[PDB]
Structures are given as C-alpha cells and as structure tokens.
C-alpha cells in the first residue's frame, strides 16, 4: 500500500520518496488512523517543498482529521510561516473550526506566533470566533497579558 508509505515520507520530509510514490499511484489523500493526510503531516513537520508538491497533485487543502484539524490549523500551531502562506494561497479556509472550537488564529495566538497571527488577520481571520469556552483570540491575549498580541489583534 503506497498510501501508508506516502504518509511516512510526507512526515519524514523525504521529497524524492514523495515524488516516486505519487508517480506510482500513491493516494495523495490517504489518511492514517486519525484522519491525517500527507498534507497534514508535511504541514505539521515543516516540509514546505512537500506541501507545495502535494498541493500541485490534488491534495485537499482543507481536509480534516478526526479532531477537525485542517493543515492550516497545524501549520499555525507549530509556527511554519511559509507553509501558512502557501496553504492560504491554495485556498485554505482561514476560519476553519476544529472540535475544540479553535481556529488557526486561536492556535497562532496561543503559541505566540505573532507574524502568523498578522498573516491570518490579513486573510480575514475572524476576531469574533469563539472556542468552546467562549474565548476569542483577543480574549486569550487579554487573559494572558500578551500586550504585543493584543495590539496586533486590535488593527
């Protein structure tokens, strides 16, 4: 099964291995047991070149795993700015909501990825989006005393 091998090559950052598997029919939209796709894993682990190649060959930019996480959620959580940009250019849903009520904006705010917060805002991130406890990204910045983040979120 070339799907499980593509999932592993995407996570590991094995560019050539990714190219070969797709050339032999590997399912670009294969899922692991939790619903993660090669694009999820390459976005999580920071493999920008594999992200771009997957998006060139039919990857669903907005696929969700079993917890509602999209690739943009994971890129924003881990802090891969260039990958965030590529995903948005290819149609990523800037306001996708996962099973915890989090948007990519929530996750970039929590982890202090301020440059990514700015990019998400510029692409229409919803400042009024509440997680399951009622918190927006701005609420998190106030509760946290993160003055740099709060300034950014008031623009």
């Amino acid at each position: 099964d070339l799907g499980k091998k593509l999932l592993e090559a995407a996570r590991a950052g094995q560019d050539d291995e990714v190219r070969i598997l797709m050339a032999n029919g590997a399912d670009v939209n294969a899922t692991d047991a939790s619903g993660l796709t090669p694009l999820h894993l390459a976005a999580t682990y920071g493999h920008l070149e594999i992200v771009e190649v997957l998006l060139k060959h039919g990857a669903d930019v907005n696929a969700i795993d079993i917890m509602g996480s999209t690739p943009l959620h994971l890129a924003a959580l881990i802090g891969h700015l260039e990958i965030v940009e590529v995903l948005l250019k290819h149609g990523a849903d800037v306001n996708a909501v996962d099973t915890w009520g989090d948007t990519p904006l929530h996750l970039a705010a929590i982890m202090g990825h301020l440059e990514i917060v700015e990019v998400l805002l510029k692409h229409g991130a919803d400042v009024n989006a509440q997680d399951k406890f009622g918190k927006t990204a701005f609420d998190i910045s106030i509760d946290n005393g993160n003055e740099d983040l709060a300034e950014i979120l008031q623009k």
């Binding site: 996480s69 959580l77 802090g79 915890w100 929590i110 982890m111 202090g112 509760d143 946290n144 005393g145």
Partner: protein, 431 residues
C-alpha cells in the same frame, strides 16, 4: 546551617549560573583566581556559604557544572571566572538532549546522573553543616528540565533533611519560538511541585517584557535577560551571604515563605530595573524603592500581583538608608494595599536590610512574593501545553524514549490542580 551546594544544569542553567558566580564573587571581593581583594570583613564572614577555602587563602565555588552537551563546558571556561571552578566538578555528556525532556530525564540524562551524584556526594561530605542545595536550570529545554528534575529527585533520596531550592527559568514564545517547550516545562513543573522546597520563578516572558518595553531594548539578548536574572539572584541570596539579624538560611526561608508544601513557587522582583552599561543618577528614595518593588512591572514572573493575594512576602533592602523610613514605607504599602495581603497570616511581610549595596548602586531592593497570582504563569504554560497535546504534535519524540503518554496527562492534571489550589487560597477569607 552553613554550606550551600550549587548545581547548574544545561545551557540556561550554566549561563545564569556563571553570571551568579561573577556577581557574588565581585560582592565578596573574590577575583577570578580565587584570591580575596576586598576591603571589608563583612565580605568574608559568610564566604563559606558559597565557597570552599583551599590552599593559600584561595576560595573555590561549591559549584557543580552539568550538561549533556559538551560545548557548554568550553563556554563556561572561556568566561571571566571560568578557571575558578574545580575542574573535577565539570560533569558533561557526549550529545545534548535536543530539547527532549525524555532524553534528559530517562535516557541520555539518566546515563550521566550517577557521575553528577558522585561529585555532589564529594562536595556534601566535606561540608561542616550542609543546609541544602540550589539548582539553576531552564524548564523549556531537555537537559536542565529533564535531567535537572531527575537530579533533584535523586538528591532528594540521598539527602532527605536538606532543603532543595531552584532558580527555574520558565519558557516564553517571545524568547524561543520552539513549540515543545510547554511540554518540557509542564513535565518539569510536575516534578518541581513534589520534589523542591522553594522555587524562584524566573519567567523569560517577564524578562523579555522588561527589556523590550521598560528598558527600550528593541532586540533583547540572553545577556540582557541574564542581567536581570543575576541582579535578582544576588538580591534573593543577600541574606544568606552577609550576616543579618534575620538569621537567614534556606530552611528558615522555607518555613516563613511556604504555608502549604506545594505552593512554593516565588515571584521575584527587583528595583531599580537597569540595562547594563547604562548608569543613571539613580539615587532612588526609599519610597521609590518600596513602590517599585511591589509594581507588576518589576516582577520577574509575568503575573500581575494585583490579580491575586500575597500569602507571604520578603523584601530585602540593600544600601545605606534610614531603617525608620523603610519601616514607615513598608507599613504604608500594607495599609494602602491591605486587600492584597491575606488576613489569615498575620505579620506576613518581612523586611531585611543589608548595609552593602550591589555593584554600581547606592540603593536597591529585592522582592520575594508567595502570591496566588503566580497561577497566571502556570495557566499560560498550561494553555500552550494543552494546545499542543490535543493535536499530539511531536509526542513520538517522547514516547519513542520509552516515556508513556499518561505521564503527559498526569503532568497537565497536576499543574491544573496547582492552579486550583492557588485560586482556593486566593478566595479564602478569615471570616
């Protein structure tokens, strides 16, 4: 109760540890070769707390230097005081831990811990009356955090009636945007809650904020941050290093600052806040020193004390100043801010005064608070921990070291229990 054994683990631990020894060596008139060139006998009365006396009136730090990463060895030795440390007290591994708590606590770190314990035992056995240990480390890395907490637990086993005190540097995205740091810190706090008697919370979030917003340093460096840390570490150990009517030692500090065993995480603060190589006609009055010491902007943990309540406070004034004026200012702050101090611990703010100011200042004040507001620091780390853990990012780095996924849930639960306990005593009334 004389000697303290000092341990420094990991990059952060050794870097702030080296600065500590530079700063207090200068205060005690000790030069980089170990000779005493001071002109006051107050400098020598308690020199034995931190230094061993060796051949020919030369003083050697009772300090053990640990790191899985060998390059830290060289950085310390190349420092001004790098040649003062006992060469046999350098205990270093082959490869670092790569920000992996599991490697520090369970694999690489556990392979080296016994060699550290051997040097600790040697330093401990030569002490007249050992009072306990102080450890400098970060919680965001792998060595200082993972191996640091393993060391603590092992020392705990060998020396159960000795106090364990830590200077623990808490991580911040503002200083290191490396996203496994909440994992390492939360796993570490789990350990520190059970195994240390007193912890100074040195928050890189606060240190950055002070440098960037108060000192106007557009791109703070570790040296900018550590300048604040060494001022703090000197201030909070002043009562241990110079004779004082307060009879200060690590156990009395614990007895008077820690009303509940787990709630032993202190918010330190310091005034005046300065940038290095930036003298100013300071000459802070006693009223300015007192107000700044209680100001949220002067805290080394990123918490607003006005959001919680002080269980206990110690305030150490250094320099030549009116004792009466200090007494009046200290009573003022408690009478105005009355609602911020718990009413069920009478006389819970202590004042100490040391004649000798730190280098470069005529007046100085150091704050040690046991404040329920510190829950804001643990809630910040907890929220980042939870954001990562809910998506299970990079968990395989940890379980791949034999670590189990239930230790993550247990650590997160214990730290949230800690937050609930602070809130409990924050809301308690004397009724």
């Amino acid at each position: 109760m004389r000697e303290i054994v000092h341990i420094q683990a990991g990059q952060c631990g050794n870097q702030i540890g080296a600065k500590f020894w530079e700063v207090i060596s200068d205060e005690h008139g000790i030069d980089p070769t170990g000779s005493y060139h001071g002109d006051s006998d107050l400098q020598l009365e308690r020199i034995n707390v931190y230094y061993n006396e060796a051949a020919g009136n030369k003083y050697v730090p009772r300090a053990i230097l640990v790191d899985l990463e060998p390059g830290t060895m060289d950085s310390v030795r190349s420092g001004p005081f790098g040649q003062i440390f006992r060469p046999d007290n350098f205990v270093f591994g082959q490869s670092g831990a790569g920000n992996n708590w599991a490697k520090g606590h369970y694999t690489e770190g556990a392979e080296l811990v016994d060699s550290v314990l051997d040097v600790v035992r040697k330093e401990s056995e030569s002490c007249d009356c050992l009072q306990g240990f102080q450890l400098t480390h970060s919680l965001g890395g792998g060595t200082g955090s993972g191996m640091g907490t393993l060391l603590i637990s092992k020392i705990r086993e060998e020396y159960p009636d000795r106090i364990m005190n830590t200077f623990s540097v808490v991580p911040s995205p503002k200083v290191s945007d490396t996203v496994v740091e909440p994992y390492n810190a939360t796993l570490s706090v789990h350990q520190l809650v059970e195994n240390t008697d007193e912890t100074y919370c040195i928050d890189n979030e606060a240190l950055y904020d002070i440098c960037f917003r108060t000192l106007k340093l557009t791109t703070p460096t570790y040296g900018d941050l550590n300048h604040l840390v060494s001022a703090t570490m000197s201030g909070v150990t002043t009562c241990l290093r110079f004779p004082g009517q307060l009879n200060a030692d690590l156990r009395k500090l614990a007895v008077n600052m820690v009303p509940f065993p787990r709630l032993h995480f202190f918010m330190p603060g310091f005034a005046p806040l300065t940038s290095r190589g930036s003298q100013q006609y300071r000459a802070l009055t006693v009223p300015e020193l007192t107000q700044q010491m209680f100001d949220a902007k002067n805290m080394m943990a990123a918490c607003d004390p006005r959001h919680g309540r002080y269980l206990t406070v110690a305030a150490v004034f250094r320099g030549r100043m009116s004792m009466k004026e200090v007494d009046e200012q200290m009573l003022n702050v408690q009478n105005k801010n009355s609602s911020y101090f718990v009413e069920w611990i009478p006389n819970n703010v202590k004042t100490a005064v040391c004649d000798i100011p730190p280098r470069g200042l005529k007046m100085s004040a150091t704050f040690i608070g046991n404040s329920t507001a510190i829950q804001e620091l643990f809630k910040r780390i907890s929220e980042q921990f939870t954001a990562m853990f809910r998506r299970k990012a990079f968990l395989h780095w940890y379980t791949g070291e034999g670590m189990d996924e239930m230790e993550f849930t247990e650590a997160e639960s214990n730290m949230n229990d800690l937050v609930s306990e602070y809130q409990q005593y924050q809301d308690a009334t004397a009724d």
